[PDB]
A paper describes a structure:
Kelch repeat and BTB domain-containing protein 4 (KBTBD4) is the substrate receptor of a cullin3-dependent E3 ligase complex (CRL3KBTBD4). Recurrent indel mutations in the Kelch domain of the KBTBD4 E3 ligase rewire epigenetic programs for stemness in medulloblastoma by recruiting LSD1-CoREST-HDAC1/2 complexes as neo-substrates for ubiquitination and degradation. UM171, an investigational drug for haematopoietic stem cell transplantation, was found to degrade LSD1-CoREST-HDAC1/2 complexes in a wild-type KBTBD4-dependent manner, suggesting a potential common mode of action. The mutant and drug-induced complexes adopt similar structural assemblies requiring both Kelch domains in the KBTBD4 dimer for each HDAC2 interaction.
To determine the structure of the lower affinity KBTBD4WT complex mediated by UM171, we used the BS3 crosslinker to stabilise the binding of the CoREST1NT2-HDAC2 neo-substrate. This sample yielded 2:2 and 2:1 KBTBD4WT-UM171-HDAC2 complexes at 2.9 Å and 3.1 Å, respectively. The cryo-EM datasets for the KBTBD4WT-UM171-HDAC2 complexes yielded 2:1 and 2:2 models displaying an RSMD value of 1.55 Å across 1055 Cα positions. Superposition of the 2:1 and 2:2 states shows that the high structural conservation extends across the protein-compound and protein-protein interaction sites, indicating that the neo-substrate recruitment mechanism in these complexes is conserved regardless of the stoichiometry. The asymmetric 2:1 and 2:1:1 models allowed comparison of the equivalent KBTBD4WT site 1 in both the bound and unbound states. Interestingly, UM171 was only observed in the HDAC2-bound site 1 and not in the second Kelch domain, suggesting that UM171 binding requires both proteins to be present. Notably, UM171 binding exhibited an induced-fit mechanism requiring the opening of a cleft between Kelch domain blades II and III to accommodate the benzyl group of UM171. In the UM171-bound KBTBD4WT protomer, L356 (BC III loop) is shifted a further 3.4 Å away from P311 (BC II loop) and 4.1 Å from L335 (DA III loop) relative to the unbound site 1 in the other KBTBD4WT protomer. Similar to site 1, site 2 in the 2:1 model shows subtle conformational changes between the HDAC2-bound and unbound states. In particular, KBTBD4WT L406 in the BC IV loop shows a shift of 6.9 Å to pack together with KBTBD4WT F408 and F409 into a shallow hydrophobic pocket on the HDAC2 surface.
Numbering used by the authors:
A (entry chain B): 10 to 375
B (entry chain A): 28 to 92, 101 to 230, 240 to 262, 267 to 474, 481 to 500, 504 to 520, 525 to 534
C (entry chain C): 27 to 92, 100 to 192, 197 to 213, 220 to 230, 292 to 306, 309 to 316, 324 to 343, 346 to 475, ...
The structure:
């Protein structure tokens, strides 16, 4: 089907500070891989418009947005009592042109959601957004603005019920918090639980009140491999959309889930990770693929080109083209990665118990 | 025991104690039923055939087949018999050699192993050759290795010991079999040893490696020390990671630090180059987790530590050096953070920290819990430490030295379940064990380092980072 | 201390007691040596040892210190098993030679056996032989057995030995149709518990009714246990309102209607069975935590000390895990669950005992003064005699 790609050229020039894990340069890597891979021609490439703060504040509190608009590396000594209540400063560091990047990230995500909103296209691959951790009141994670919330909020104007599948290692607590109460959004995250960063996802926690039986979280242990992931992923989404029947899916492809990650304990293959996309593609609904958490920039690039190829339904070879970033990839220089062996503490009885419990957590869904 | 109301077997768990405490109270307090008289150096002792035969397998062979012995001395015999009757004896350094030989000759293994371990713990370069020869004669494996190891570490100084010259070829070859680093110049002493093929055909040079790493000054710098010459330390490395280290462990001759922004990564300095390597990042978001290096498993363990939610974590995860993978293991009995961690021949001890109080608080902790590496199981010691809180434990030989807040310094021995108070000269201190000595470092200096030996409890001052956040053994 | 491990310290061999105990075991009976004494009982001769006999018995010490010696009133069998007990430490008790062993082990100074036979003679007391046991506990210095004989003499006083009973014993028997007998003389709900005839029962897990009203629970819990310690009703374990296993314990003083908080169990369990044994609380299995997100049937034993306020897990595991229901008959707890496999647990000794049950539903075991009553969840009232292991329908 028709595919829409959103990427601003000057999005890899937003250095997060020395030593920080999240590097937006990975967004350029994918877009530099796509051109040399013979995929740019087949896909409708757009340019994301800087989202206005008045449009950005459709979910976030106005004071938070103004605080983001004013914070600068220099004008910071005075801005000292605001960083200690907005969680900015230490884990979510300030950098030159922070708000400009905060508008580029939300830009393509809302433009894409507008394009599927108008029933004009089918897939919108925004590899620049996907920041799923910025809470309503204040920043969290590595994010500052939760572009995902604006994307869903745009879809909700016309579409009645909307899905959001997240396959990032983390829980994506921001989105869940934004749609705990409401029944119009069905969030399903496949995170890792137990002394991990979000710490909120648990089998016992569901959307409160009107969101009862919706926020389906699947806790996991470290080292879950492709075969287990495939065996678990399909029979849950095929039941969620069989009792929810969402009009549109917002699927986020975190690149932490891959093996060899800097901040991830999973063990995955690009085929295994980018099989969630060939799964959802067979349901033939408007689909919005976002980027997101990825910290092995080399594997993030390798991963994100492949689902882009899957969305086009194209077939692509392992030999990497001689791009600008060719020297970065491994000595084999191939696309697909092999999983370094690590024990899978997701024992079959463990996953089967969770799968069953989730199954009655959706059989009660109206 | 078919039916409790009709017929069953009745077992007394207190019977063994009833007999053991009914033996002291009679055979010693009020001498009765003394069938046999045994005299040592003309000092008769009224002894029972039954007790001595029931404990010793050597006296029984004599009773079944007024006895007078020759090798044993009266004083050593008195406490030996008071051990057979009581079970508790006061071991003394001066006369332990005789206890070793006599107890082995009497097949009293318990008081033979405990002096095969007393000897193995107080062995020094002055008497290393003599004890190694004695262990060879008495066929003791653990003491033999613990004496050859000391000889091989200090082989350079032993070149003029007058016993190295007068040694059988088998012992010299076994000494030069392994270790013996090039700093000791094995070839020079081996040449004078003849004054000759096996000695030169098998002399593996280990090569001296840096054994002490200080982390401090906060551009935090990691300096390296190597005790050389006599009772002196030197410097051989000023590596600076330029990051924020929050935990560290020394495995082998390598310094596995952890830290940086989002302190979940890893590094490693071989000390042979300023080029840091990259290891698998820690798969957990935990801080104040102790790092224990187990060389007998080629692993590094992370135990305890706080979560990001201010809840204590009782999770243990190890890291294979070869496979470069972090794997989960059995959880601890109770959750701790900041607890000193020491590995003693496979058993990892977690000493103190901040245990979870009943009222959602972190009280200073005094527990001693040990997790066995081989059985992979963890259990709590019934007794507790005298001081609770932050402390820096360093294994030395078979016992653990623990310096907490204050100036007191205990000497915990795990097998005996007993402590030994030692007073440091008059600030939270830090200790380690280079070579065969103990070094104690002041937290902030602006004397800095004191070298002490537990024998005589003497603290000699020995002689630049303002801050010393981490010191590794 | 003042003991340098590198200079001078004392070594305590924790294996000395066992070493000598087994040395006696091996070198005394298996092979006879160093006998130095000979004791004759009813013709039979035992080649004993002076030291062991005088070690744990002061009758053979006060009687040895102050060749063949003959005893006066002991059977050749009973004395032989006594010798085994003084030598091995594990004897096989039998109900036929019980009355004799009590006296012979009392006139000898073997206290542990004296208490053992006292417990045996107190858990097997029958109303027919109650008065004789009372006389036995009167001649010998046994208060506990005396009270146990008093109970069966009092709770069955309506029904030879009583005809000629002295007034001295009768006064104690009557202290705790009495006049007619004495005429002859010598001429929904989550948890609940029964506290001396008060059927306390636990809307929300906070209400208590006796109907009547009582103080509410300081915690909302489900599948929490409840005991009847005579001096408060204790609540342990349970499942929280957030579907997480509970770990807290609270008293309930009958006098002052307040629930005090106390020490927490070492292992948080749910649906466990509770049994009070003379001031020590026993929790029986339950639904332990599994996979950090669910539960599993459990076989664990929790000993909680009420007087000292401590908790501890014994290493032994129950024969059958899962939900269980237990009762206290006498000096021990009888445990049953679905499966018709009754077990008996005697906390003092380290041993269970299995027993067959009719095939016939989750069973519900009780413990009356008379005997045991095992009910069925669907199958009528039963009464089984543990001595014979035979069940009789009501
Ligand atoms: C999507 N995503 N990718 N990566 C992360 C992420 C984000 C943050 C952290 C993190 C990972 N690992 C971390 N480890 C530590 C070390 C530690 C552990 C336990 C207890 C105390 C400290 N502290 C972190 N932050 C603090 C929070 C409080 C603030 N005052 C200072 C910075 C973080 N999220
Ligand atoms: Zn992520």
């Amino acid at each position: 089907k028709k595919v829409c790609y959103y990427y601003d050229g000057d999005i890899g020039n937003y250095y997060y500070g020395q030593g920080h894990p999240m590097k937006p340069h990975r967004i350029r890597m994918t877009h530099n891989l796509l051109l040399n891979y013979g995929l740019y021609r087949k896909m409708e490439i757009y340019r994301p418009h800087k989202a206005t703060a008045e449009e950005m504040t459709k979910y976030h509190s106005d004071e938070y947005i103004k605080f983001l608009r004013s914070i600068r590396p220099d004008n910071m000594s005075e801005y000292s009592k605001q960083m200690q209540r907005f969680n900015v400063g230490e884990d979510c560091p300030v950098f030159d042109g922070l708000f400009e990047f905060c508008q580029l990230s939300t830009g393509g995500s809302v433009a894409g959601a507008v394009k599927l909103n108008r029933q004009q296209t089918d897939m919108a691959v925004n590899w620049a957004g996907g920041l799923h951790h910025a809470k309503k009141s204040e920043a969290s994670g590595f994010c500052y603005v939760n572009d995902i919330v604006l994307a869903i909020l745009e879809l909700l104007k016309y579409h009645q019920r909307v899905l959001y599948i997240d396959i990032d290692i983390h829980h994506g607590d921001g989105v869940e918090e934004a749609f705990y109460t409401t029944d119009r959004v069905m969030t399903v995250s496949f995170h890792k639980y137990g002394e991990y960063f979000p710490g909120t996802g648990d089998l016992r926690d569901i959307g409160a009140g009107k969101g009862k039986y919706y926020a389906v979280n699947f806790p996991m242990r470290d080292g879950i491999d492709d075969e287990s992931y495939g065996q678990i992923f399909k029979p849950i989404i095929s039941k969620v959309m069989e009792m929810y029947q969402p009009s549109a899916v917002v699927l986020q492809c975190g690149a932490d889930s891959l093996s060899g990650d800097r901040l991830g304990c999973f063990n995955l293959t690009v085929k295994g990770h980018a099989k969630c996309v060939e799964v959802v593609k067979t349901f033939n609904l408007p689909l919005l693929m976002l980027g997101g958490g990825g910290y092995t920039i080399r594997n993030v690039a390798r991963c994100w080109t492949y689902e882009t190829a899957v969305a086009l339904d194209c077939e692509i070879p392992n030999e990497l083209p001689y791009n600008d970033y060719f020297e970065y990839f491994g000595p084999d220089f191939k696309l697909h990665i092999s999983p370094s062996n690590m024990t899978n503490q997701n024992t079959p009885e463990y996953m089967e118990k969770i799968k069953q419990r989730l199954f009655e957590n959706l059989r009660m869904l109206p | 025991d078919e039916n409790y109301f009709v017929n069953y077997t009745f077992k007394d768990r207190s019977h063994s104690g009833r007999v053991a405490q009914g033996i002291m109270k009679l055979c010693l307090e009020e001498e009765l039923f003394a069938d046999v008289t045994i005299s040592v150096e003309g000092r008769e002792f009224q002894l029972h055939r039954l007790v001595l035969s029931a404990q010793s397998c050597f006296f029984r062979s004599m009773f079944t087949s007024v006895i007078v012995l020759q090798d044993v001395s009266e004083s050593v015999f008195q406490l030996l018999v008071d051990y057979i009757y009581h079970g508790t004896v006061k071991l003394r350094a001066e006369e332990l050699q005789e206890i070793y030989e006599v107890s082995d000759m009497y097949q009293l293994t318990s008081l033979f192993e405990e002096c095969s371990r007393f000897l193995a713990r107080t062995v020094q370069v002055g008497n290393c050759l003599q004890v190694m020869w004695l262990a060879d004669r008495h066929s003791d494996p653990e003491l033999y290795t613990a004496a050859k190891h000391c000889a091989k570490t200090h082989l350079a100084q032993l070149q003029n010991t007058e016993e190295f010259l007068h040694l059988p070829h088998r012992l010299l070859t076994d000494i030069i079999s392994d270790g013996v680093p090039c700093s000791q110049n094995p070839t020079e002493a081996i040449e004078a040893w003849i004054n000759a093929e096996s000695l030169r055909t098998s002399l593996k040079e280990i090569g001296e490696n840096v054994h002490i790493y200080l982390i401090g000054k906060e551009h935090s710098l990691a300096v390296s020390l190597h005790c050389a010459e006599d009772d002196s330390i030197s410097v051989s490395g000023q590596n600076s990671l330029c990051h924020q280290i929050t935990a560290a462990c020394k495995h082998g001759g390598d310094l596995y630090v952890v830290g940086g922004s989002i302190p979940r990564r890893m590094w490693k300095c071989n000390n042979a180059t300023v080029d840091w390597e990259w290891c698998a990042p820690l798969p957990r978001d935990r801080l104040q987790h102790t790092l224990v290096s187990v060389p007998g498993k080629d692993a590094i363990y992370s135990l305890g530590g706080k979560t990001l939610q201010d809840t204590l974590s009782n999770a243990v995860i190890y890291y294979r050096v070869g496979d470069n993978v972090w794997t989960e293991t059995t959880q601890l009995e109770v959750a701790v953070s900041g607890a000193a961690g020491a590995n003693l021949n496979g058993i990892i001890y977690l000493l103190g920290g901040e245990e979870n109080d009943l009222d959602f608080f972190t009280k200073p902790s005094r527990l001693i819990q040990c997790f066995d590496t081989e059985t992979d199981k963890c259990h709590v010691k019934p007794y507790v430490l005298p001081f609770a809180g932050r402390m820096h434990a360093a294994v030395h030989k078979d016992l653990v030295f623990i310096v907490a807040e204050g100036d007191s310094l205990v000497c915990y021995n795990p097998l005996l379940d007993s402590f030994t108070r030692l007073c440091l000269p008059e600030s939270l201190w830090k200790i380690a064990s280079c070579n065969g000595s103990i070094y104690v470092f002041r937290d902030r200096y602006k004397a800095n380092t004191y070298k002490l030996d537990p024998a005589t409890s003497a603290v000699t001052v020995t002689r630049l980072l303002t801050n010393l956040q981490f010191v590794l053994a």
